[PDB]
C-alpha cells in the first residue's frame, strides 16, 4: 500500500481515513489507494470497497442511497458522492466569542441548526484551549476549493419547500433529504411565464456573475447560499437577516461547510446592497448598520422625499451611509398624499392602488407593517346616462372590437421607427374607420359610446389624451416581466409606508433645490433661498415635469442626449375627486362591486368620471372616488372645486336616474396639475418616444449625480412601486462606490 494521495497537487502529507467503516480500515497507515474528497479529507481503499463491493457489509447502505439519489436527483451516485453526503463528519464553529474555533464532531453526531446555534468546544479542562485542527485554516486558501472533488449540497434548506419542482442537486441541495405570505414568490417555477422580481434557482443573474466570477464554472455553492438567504428573508422579513442567523441553517458534511460559512457573509452583503433582502420598511440603527464599515465613509444629498427619494434614503441610511434629504414642499410623500379626515376611511388624493402584488415591494412592506390590502373583484358594469346597465352582449362585442383594434396597432408598429411614429389615438381611429368601410358592419351610437369608455380607460392609464401617446411605445414596459397577481386597494393608504420609510431620517422640508454644481471636488447644492449644502454624491428624484421645466440649474448642464430623452416622455396627468355621502345610495344597483363604469355621452367627455370607486371594501361607509382623465383634465382647469363637484353630482344623478341621490357632505378635488413642485400624475411615452428614454434619464453622471423616480424606471414606470425600486437601484449604485 501507499501513504500518498491519488489527487495531483494535494498537499495532504499524511492522509487518514475519516470513514472507518470497514473492519479493515487502514486508518493512518498503508492502503492500496487513498481516495480524495478534499485536501483534508480522504478514505482508504478498504472503506471504499466496504460500500462499493457487493460482497461487503456496507453495500446495502450504498445501494439504497443510490436508489433515493435516483428517484430524486440528476447527478451520478458515485461512492465519493455517497461519502460527502452520508459519511463525512460534520464541523461546527465554537460560539464562545473569544474562541470561535472550528471543531470536528464525532461520526455518529448529526449536526442540526440548534446544535450549531449554541455550540461550544467540548459539548458532548479548557476545551477551547485545545489547538484548532490544522486542516481548518487550509480551507481559506483559494486553491482549497479548486481541489474539492464535488460541490457542497445543502441539507434541509429553508428554500427546499419552495423548490420541489427542481432536481435538488441542480439548485445546490441534496437529493437524499425530505405559512408564507402568498405574495412572496422569489423563485421562478419551471415553465413559468415571466414575472417581476423573480430569480432562477438554478442560474446566476448577470450582476451575480459580475460580482462573483469565480462561480461561472460551477455556481452550485453560490445558488444554494443565495437561495437559502432569500428563503430566510421571506420567512421573516421583519428582522435584519445576519450571517449569525444564516449559519445554523447551513447544514452540509465536511470541511466544505467551513467554506460555505465563509461565503455566506459575502453573498449576504451583496444581496443587501442590491436590495433583495434587508429592505422595505425594515429600520436599523447605530451599531446595526447592514453593510460593513467599508461602505460607510461617503455622503449623499437626496433631492425629493417621495417614494423614490425615501427609498434611496432608507436604503443608504440602513447601510450606514450619511444621507440628507431635501424636500421642496412642507410635507413628505410627493404624489403620495392621503386624506384621513373622511369618516372611518383613508382616501388617497394621489396613489392608492397596488398593481400586481406578487413579489411587489409594497406587498412586502405591508407584511412588515401587518397591513391588509383589499383585492379588487373583476366586475365593473358599464352604466349609461341615465340608469341603464349595458347589455352583456353589447359589452362583450365592443370589448372584443376595442382589443382587436389594439392587435392591429401592435401589428402596424412592427416595422416602424421612432421617426415614423403616429399617435395611438389617431392610429386606432383610422383603423376603426377603415374597418367600418371594409366590412359594411355599422355600430349603434351606444356601441360607439362603449368603445369610447375603453378609450377613456387607456387615457386614464397613460395620464394623457390618446393623440399625445406613442402608438409604437405606449406599452413599451411590457417587453419586461411585469408584476403578477392581485391588484389591490391599499386601504390604509400609501402614507403609512411613506411615514415608516422617512421615520428618523435627516429630512429638510421647505427646501426647494435650485442649483446643483458638480464641477468641483464635491457637489454644491443651493436652495431657492440661498441655503448651501454639500456632499460627495447627489441623487435627484424630482418629477419628470420639473426636469422638463428646468427648475434645477445643473452645472455642468445635463447632456443634450439626456434632454432629448427627458422631453420625449410626457408628464401625464389625472385628477381625483372624492365624495362623502350620508348613506350608501348605490348598493341596490351596484351590488357590492368595487367599482362601476360610466358610459360616455360623447368622445369629448369620455374622461370625465369614467370609473367610480367604492372606497370602503367593508361596505359600511359611503365614500366614492372618481378620476378625471384625457381631454376632461383640460376642461376642468378653469373650474373651481365646487363646479367640478357639481358636474360629478350631475353625472351620478344621471347614472342613478331611476332613484334619488343624497347630497355629498364632504369632498375634495385634486389639482396636481398646478402643484408647482409636481405638476403631473405619472409619465408616459409621447409620440416619437422610446422606452429607452427611461434608461437614459436613469443614467448617472460621472458616478456623481444620480437619478431616480417613476420616470426613470423603464421596467416599472408610473407607479409607487416603480419609484420605490428606482430608489433601491440608485442606493445600490451609490453604495458600491
Amino acid at each position: 500500500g501507499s501513504r500518498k494521495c491519488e489527487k495531483a497537487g494535494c498537499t495532504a502529507t499524511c492522509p487518514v481515513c475519516f470513514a472507518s467503516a470497514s473492519e479493515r480500515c487502514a486508518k493512518n497507515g498503508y492502503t492500496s489507494r487513498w481516495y480524495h474528497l478534499s485536501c483534508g479529507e480522504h478514505f482508504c481503499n478498504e472503506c471504499f470497497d466496504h460500500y462499493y463491493r457487493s460482497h461487503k457489509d456496507g453495500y446495502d447502505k450504498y445501494t439504497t442511497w443510490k436508489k433515493i439519489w435516483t428517484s430524486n436527483g440528476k447527478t451520478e451516485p458515485s461512492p465519493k458522492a455517497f461519502m460527502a453526503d452520508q459519511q463525512l463528519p460534520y464541523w461546527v464553529q465554537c460560539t464562545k466569542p473569544e474562541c470561535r474555533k472550528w471543531r470536528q464532531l464525532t461520526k455518529e453526531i448529526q449536526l442540526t441548526p440548534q446544535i450549531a446555534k449554541t455550540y461550544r468546544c467540548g459539548m458532548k479542562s479548557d476545551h477551547c484551549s485545545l489547538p484548532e485542527d490544522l486542516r481548518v485554516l487550509e480551507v481559506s486558501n483559494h486553491w482549497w476549493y479548486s481541489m474539492l472533488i464535488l460541490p457542497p449540497l445543502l441539507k434541509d434548506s429553508v428554500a427546499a419547500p419552495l423548490l420541489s419542482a427542481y432536481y435538488p442537486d441542480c439548485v445546490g441541495m441534496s437529493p437524499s433529504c425530505t405559512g408564507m405570505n402568498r405574495y412572496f414568490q422569489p423563485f421562478y417555477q419551471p415553465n413559468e411565464c415571466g414575472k417581476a422580481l423573480c430569480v432562477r434557482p438554478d442560474v446566476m443573474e448577470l450582476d451575480e456573475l459580475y460580482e462573483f466570477p469565480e462561480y461561472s464554472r460551477d455556481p452550485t455553492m453560490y445558488l444554494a447560499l443565495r437561495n437559502l438567504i432569500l428563503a430566510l428573508w421571506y420567512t421573516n422579513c421583519k428582522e435584519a437577516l445576519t450571517p449569525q442567523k444564516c449559519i445554523p441553517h447551513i447544514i452540509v458534511r465536511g470541511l466544505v461547510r467551513i467554506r460555505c460559512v465563509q461565503e455566506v457573509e459575502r453573498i449576504l452583503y451583496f444581496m443587501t446592497r442590491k436590495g433583495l433582502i434587508n429592505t422595505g420598511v425594515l429600520s436599523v440603527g447605530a451599531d446595526q448598520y447592514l453593510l460593513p464599515k467599508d461602505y460607510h465613509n461617503k455622503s449623499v444629498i437626496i433631492i425629493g422625499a417621495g417614494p423614490a427619494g425615501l427609498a434611496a434614503a432608507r436604503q443608504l441610511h440602513n447601510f450606514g451611509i450619511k444621507v440628507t434629504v431635501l424636500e421642496a414642499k412642507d410635507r413628505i410623500g410627493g404624489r403620495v398624499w392621503d386624506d384621513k379626515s373622511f369618516k372611518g376611511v383613508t382616501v388617497g388624493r394621489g396613489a392608492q392602488i397596488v398593481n400586481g402584488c406578487i413579489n411587489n415591494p409594497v406587498a412586502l412592506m405591508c407584511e412588515q407593517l401587518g397591513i391588509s390590502m383589499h383585492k379588487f373583484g373583476e366586475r365593473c358594469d358599464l352604466i349609461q346616462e341615465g340608469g341603464r346597465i349595458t347589455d352583456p352582449t353589447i359589452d362583450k362585442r365592443m370589448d372584443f372590437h376595442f382589443n382587436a383594434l389594439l392587435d392591429v396597432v401592435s401589428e402596424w408598429r412592427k416595422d416602424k421607427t421612432q421617426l415614423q411614429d403616429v399617435p395611438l389615438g389617431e392610429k386606432i381611429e383610422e383603423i376603426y374607420k377603415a374597418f367600418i368601410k371594409e366590412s359594411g358592419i355599422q355600430f349603434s351610437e351606444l356601441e360607439g359610446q362603449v368603445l369610447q369608455f375603453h378609450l377613456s380607460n387607456l387615457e386614464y392609464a397613460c395620464g394623457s389624451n390618446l393623440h399625445q401617446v406613442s402608438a409604437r411605445s405606449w406599452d413599451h414596459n411590457e417587453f419586461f416581466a411585469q408584476f403578477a397577481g392581485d391588484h389591490t386597494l391599499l386601504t390604509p393608504g400609501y402614507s403609512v409606508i411613506i411615514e415608516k420609510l422617512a421615520e428618523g431620517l435627516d429630512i429638510q422640508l421647505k427646501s426647494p433645490v435650485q442649483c446643483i454644481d458638480y464641477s468641483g471636488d464635491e457637489v454644491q447644492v443651493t436652495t431657492t433661498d440661498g441655503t448651501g449644502y454639500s456632499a460627495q454624491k447627489v441623487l435627484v428624484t424630482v418629477p419628470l415635469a420639473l426636469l422638463q421645466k428646468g427648475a434645477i440649474q445643473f452645472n455642468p448642464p445635463l447632456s443634450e442626449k439626456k434632454m432629448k430623452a427627458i422631453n420625449s416622455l410626457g408628464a401625464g396627468i389625472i385628477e381625483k375627486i372624492a365624495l362623502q355621502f350620508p348613506y350608501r345610495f348605490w348598493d341596490s344597483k351596484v351590488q357590492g362591486a368595487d367599482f362601476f363604469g360610466h358610459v360616455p355621452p360623447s368622445a369629448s367627455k369620455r374622461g370625465l368620471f369614467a370609473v367610480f370607486y367604492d372606497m370602503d371594501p367593508q361596505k359600511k361607509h359611503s365614500v366614492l372616488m372618481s378620476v378625471i382623465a384625457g381631454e376632461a383634465v383640460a376642461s376642468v382647469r378653469t373650474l373651481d372645486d365646487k363646479q367640478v363637484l357639481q358636474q360629478c353630482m350631475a353625472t351620478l344623478r344621471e347614472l342613478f336616474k331611476e332613484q334619488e341621490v343624497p347630497d355629498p357632505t364632504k369632498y375634495f378635488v385634486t389639482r396636481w396639475s398646478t402643484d408647482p413642485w409636481i405638476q403631473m400624475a405619472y409619465s408616459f411615452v409621447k409620440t416619437g418616444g422610446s422606452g429607452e428614454a427611461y434608461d437614459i434619464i436613469a443614467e448617472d453622471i460621472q458616478g456623481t449625480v444620480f437619478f431616480a423616480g417613476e420616470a426613470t424606471n423603464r421596467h416599472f414606470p408610473q407607479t409607487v412601486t416603480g419609484a420605490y425600486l428606482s430608489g433601491v437601484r440608485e442606493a445600490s449604485k451609490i453604495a458600491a462606490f
Partner: peptide, 12 residues
C-alpha cells in the same frame, strides 16, 4: 432572454 431577468440583478 432580457424579459425574465430580475430587475435589481441586471443593472450590470
Amino acid at each position: 432572454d432580457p424579459h425574465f431577468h430580475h430587475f435589481l440583478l441586471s443593472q450590470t
